[PDB]
Symmetry: C3
Subunit: 262 residues, 3 copies
Amino acid sequence: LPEATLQTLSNSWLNYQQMTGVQGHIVLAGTRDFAPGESITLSGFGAGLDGTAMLSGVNQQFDTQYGWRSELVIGLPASMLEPAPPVRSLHIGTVAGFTADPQHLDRIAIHLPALNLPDSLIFARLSKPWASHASGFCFYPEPGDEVVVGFIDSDPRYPMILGALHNPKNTAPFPPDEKNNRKGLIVSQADQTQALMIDTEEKTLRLMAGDNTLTLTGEGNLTMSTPNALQLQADTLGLQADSNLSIAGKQQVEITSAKINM
Amino acid sequence: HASGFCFYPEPGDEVVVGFIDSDPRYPMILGALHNPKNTAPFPPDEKNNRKGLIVSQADQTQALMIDTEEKTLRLMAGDNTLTLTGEGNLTMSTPNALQLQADTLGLQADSNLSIAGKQQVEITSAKINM
Amino acid sequence: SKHDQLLQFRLSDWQFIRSRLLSTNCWLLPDAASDTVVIRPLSSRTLARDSHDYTLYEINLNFDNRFTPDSLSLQGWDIAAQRLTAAQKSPAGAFRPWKPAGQDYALAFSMLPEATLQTLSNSWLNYQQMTGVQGHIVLAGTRDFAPGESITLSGFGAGLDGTAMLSGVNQQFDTQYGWRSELVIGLPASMLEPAPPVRSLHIGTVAGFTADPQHLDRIAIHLPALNLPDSLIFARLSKPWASHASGFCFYPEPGDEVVVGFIDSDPRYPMILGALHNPKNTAPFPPDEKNNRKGLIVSQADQTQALMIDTEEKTLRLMAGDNTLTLTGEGNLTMSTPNALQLQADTLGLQADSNLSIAGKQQVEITSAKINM
């Protein structure tokens, strides 16, 4: 959407194409009584050329023969009919702090280093794989992330983040390597790495929180492994094992209940 | 090959589309773009703490969440939260039954344990040692 | 300096040369009557009104200053440092093509064309100087001139006196006028692109593994739009999240058919945007009406291992091959492993409201020091 309402730009293109309809020139002799917006009229002629015409410019043309001849100009040559001059490249930019959207979308304020504008901010749209109605991927990139930005319908006014691009100032959790075994997303603010990992060589699925790993290994074991307390509240929890069980504890073990069967 | 992300967007999602080798005949979805007719689960905010994907069809929000301020990792199903908090606790917290079938499950704790239940507790087995 | 990665993307092969001479501060000097070309960087005979040796007929000279800047301060985005490299301004008054005897241009790219932008900033400032003074000197019949001779005009008035550097010679044999070696001054115009732009989205396959010699994390791909099966092209990877030190980080497999866009319309910088399942790969489930199955999948040979969301059954199932955690909404929760499982904790306390059941076909040990009941 180029402007707020498209009434004026629709009137404006229809008017700049009318000016190509009638165009020509009237070679007069020597007067400064005319201006490029005068709207003169032709009266005494035949039925072909009689009527009011609006000028576009005047040319003076002093020379030795012909004397002085103020040529009048009617009409405008042509028009490109773009809403804005198109930029059709992919550019990259950094995210710029946080600023709320005054247009009440969820647009993320970025920079563009292709512009030499370090002070001014540009709101840009965020593209997610999933998004949805009310259930999205929703990671919303950090304020220094170097996103890659494309422009919708070749208008500079509407940018859009497409990806987010690790770089040597950020240093990604593991480089791309031969034997791509480590996978899984990572979230890590200062010291607490907290997201799931897939190691396809060891056939695992490990949910981190910093020391709380759930690590259900394929064709193998399953372990909560927390260095602190863990709780398992349920309406009626029943745990069952085939042909072995073991319950331990160095200090107290309480089976505190009303009716205990054996 | 045969193992993908595979969310396959819903029929009203407003994707952004680019065209391969400048041909109109071949379009291609690149992103999917929340919007005010959809209303994303949380807006972008200063102090980006809430993260994690969300899947929610009508009422059942069911996906994992990362809250970096509280250092958690919470797997939803609607009331079934697994919420393993970093430098902290771990809790299944389901308002219904839960089962833990295993070939040989052995649970172990260092210097405290507690097993509870308001009604019956059965340790039904063949050979019970103490 | 050696290049890391050029790319000729379906150029004419002559179009590529004079878009590479513009970025190198050189001009061609082609020679007729031979196949020898002397490429020489942008850096006298003294024909005068008094002089008997050369007869002059016409000296046109334009002296324009529309498309002649003074600076060419060019700079580009350094990927490693992220400072948008310091502005290499080029002074006007170096390489003067017209030396008489009596506005600041500035771009910034979202990329980096060469290693240092000193030479390309000098080169655009020099190719715009050649449009400043341009014309032709119609002489009579001599082969004593060449397109790089830098002759001088001496015996004239104060308007046109000074050293001018030629651009070419035209011989013009005809019946009237005899033989007239016309000299040419100045160069017509210039496009001022760092490279001829390709503004399409292309797709390519990932190419094995090769480490990045430029010490980024760029993934070496192919492009089938080129018919180059042997040569490799390093390309940047775009992730949704990435971050400082905590990313999505799946790093696509060597046969994946990614879709590739080019940053700031330069072939030298490609970039993966998506990854595109296809009938040679066969995605885990096709798109269907009643989109219920969701969730990512990782599966190398036989072990499907990632979380699944089935919105019809309201589940969240974490696979490892047989180890499913499957916490179903408004329903149950089950570890379900066909092997051992352990639950180590500092103080684990499990609690249930109004039922409990502990089982085991063989031994059950509650091995501890102090057991209460």
